[PDB]
Structure 1
Amino acid sequence: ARLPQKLMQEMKEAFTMIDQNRDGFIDINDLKEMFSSLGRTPDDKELTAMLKEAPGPLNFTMFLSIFSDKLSGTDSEETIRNAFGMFDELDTKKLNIEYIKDLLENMGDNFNKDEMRMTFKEAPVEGGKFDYVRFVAMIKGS
C-alpha cells in the first residue's frame, strides 16, 4: 500500500538538501549545518541521538527506512483541504465544530477519547466554527 512516487521524490529532495556534503550520507556536520540554516541548532547529543535512530550510516536508503512508515499514508495540504471541502458544500472553508467532532469520533475509523483530545487541544475553533484550512496548515507545519 504505497508509497506514492511523489512522496519518494520529496524524500529524496529532502535527503539531498540535508546532505550538504553531496556525500550521499547525512552525518552530524550535515545536520548541524542544516539546523543552523533554519534557526536554533540543537545540541550535539540531540543530533547524535537522531543519527542513532538509523541502524547504520545514513544513506538515502537508510533515510527511507527512517521515514517511510511514518510518512506512508500522508497526503498533500491540498488533498487534505479538499477532503475537508467535501463536508463543506457552500465552501465556507469552515466546519461546524459539532459536525467534524461527530464525523471523527463516531464514523469511519472512529477516533478514541485520547485521539479526540489531542486533536482538538490546539485546533483553531471560534464561534463554533472549525477552521480546517488553518488546521491543515498546522498539521503539516512546525
Structure 2
Amino acid sequence: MADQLTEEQIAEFKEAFSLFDKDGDGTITTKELGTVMRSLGPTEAELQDMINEVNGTIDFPEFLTMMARKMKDTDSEEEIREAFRVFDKDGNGYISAAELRHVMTNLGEKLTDEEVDEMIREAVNYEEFVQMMTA
C-alpha cells in the first residue's frame, strides 16, 4: 500500500520527479528514470530491474510504487528496533523477560492471558524479540 510512505518522503519524491523532467507530460524514459533515481539520492542491476518492471514511459504513481518497496523495509526495521529498545533505560537493549511479558500483556493491543503466556513460552534483546515475533 502507498500509505506506508510518509508525507515528507512523498513530497521529496514529487519534487525530484518534477525537477528532473522538463515542462510537459510526466512520462520519463527508463534511462532518464534511472538518472532521476540517482539524482534523488542504487545498483545498476536494481535500476535495470525497476526499469523493466515499469513505450519507455514512467509516471508518478509508478515511481511511488517502485520507491515504496525500497524505502519501507529498512525504515520499518530501524523504527521497530528503536521503539522496542525505547522502554528500557539500560542502553544494552536486553530487558527483563518477565517485565517484557508484562508490558506486552498490559500495553500494546488486546490479547488474552493464555495467548501472552504462549508467546512468552515460544520466545532477551528488544530488537531480537521484535524480529523473532515478526518472523
Q: TM-score band, normalised by the shorter chain?
A: 0.3 to 0.5
Q: Which one scores higher on RCO, CA 8 angstroms, separation ≥ 6?
A: 2
Q: Which has the higher strand share?
A: 1
Over alpha carbons, which structure has the higher Rg?
Answer: 2
Q: Which has the higher helix share?
A: 2
TM-score, structure 2 normalization? 0.45
TM-score, structure 1 normalization? 0.43
